[PDB]
C-alpha cells in the first residue's frame, strides 16, 4: 500500500519486566509532518520525547494509548511544531490491528499522544490522523493490551517506553498488499 520511509523502535517494560521490542513503519510520503514529529520525539532530538514515558490508557479489544510525556495522564504532551498542530490529512484509515494514529481533543489538536489499534476502528476514520503501522512486535502490543487496568483504564503496572530510536530506511518499501 503506502510506502514505509523510516522505522522507529520502542523497547517496553510492563512493571518490573522487559517485555520486548515493537518496530513501527511510518508513512513519510503520505503524512510527512506528522511522521517528522513522531520520529523527532522518538530520538529525543529537540531535547524532549517519548523515552521513559508511559502508556496511560489501555482498553482490551480497542487500543493502547501513550505519548503524554509532560503530564503522564492524557492532558499533556506537545509537538515539535508547538503545543498542538493541525490535522495534516486523513488519507490513511484505521484498517485493522496494529495501525498507529494521533490522539487529539477534536479538530486540529495534535500534540504527541498516539494510539496503536488492536482491532479495526472504523468509527475513528476521518477524525484521527493515521501515520504508521506495527511491522514487528504485535505480540508485545497484545501483552500490553492484556495488562490489568483500574476502572479509569489506567494500567495497574506501569507500561514504560524504556528506550526508543529511529532506524533509517535506504529504499522506501510498500506494505503487504491488498
Amino acid at each position: 500500500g503506502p510506502k514505509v520511509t523510516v522505522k522507529v523502535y520502542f523497547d517496553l517494560r510492563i512493571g518490573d519486566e522487559d517485555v520486548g521490542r515493537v518496530i513501527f513503519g511510518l508513512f513519510g510520503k503520505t503524512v510527512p509532518k506528522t511522521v517528522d514529529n513522531f520520529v523527532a520525539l522518538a530520538t529525543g532530538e529537540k531535547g524532549f520525547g517519548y523515552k521513559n514515558s508511559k502508556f496511560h490508557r489501555v482498553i482490551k479489544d480497542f487500543m493502547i494509548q501513550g505519548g503524554d510525556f509532560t503530564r503522564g495522564d492524557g492532558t499533556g504532551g506537545k509537538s515539535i511544531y508547538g503545543e498542538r498542530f493541525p490535522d495534516e490529512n486523513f488519507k490513511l484509515k484505521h484498517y485493522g490491528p496494529g495501525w498507529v494514529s494521533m490522539a487529539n481533543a477534536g479538530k486540529d489538536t495534535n500534540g504527541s499522544q498516539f494510539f496503536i489499534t488492536t482491532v479495526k476502528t472504523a468509527w475513528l476514520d476521518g477524525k484521527h490522523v493515521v501515520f504508521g503501522k506495527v511491522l514487528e512486535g504485535m505480540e508485545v502490543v497484545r501483552k500490553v493490551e492484556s495488562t490489568k487496568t483500574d476502572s479509569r483504564d489506567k494500567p495497574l503496572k506501569d507500561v514504560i517506553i524504556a528506550d526508543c530510536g529511529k532506524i533509517e530506511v535506504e529504499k522506501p518499501f510498500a506494505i503487504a498488499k491488498e
Partner: peptide, 11 residues
Amino acid sequence: XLLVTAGLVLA
C-alpha cells in the same frame, strides 16, 4: 464509548 481523546475523555 470508544474514543481516543486528550483532556476530556468521553464515553
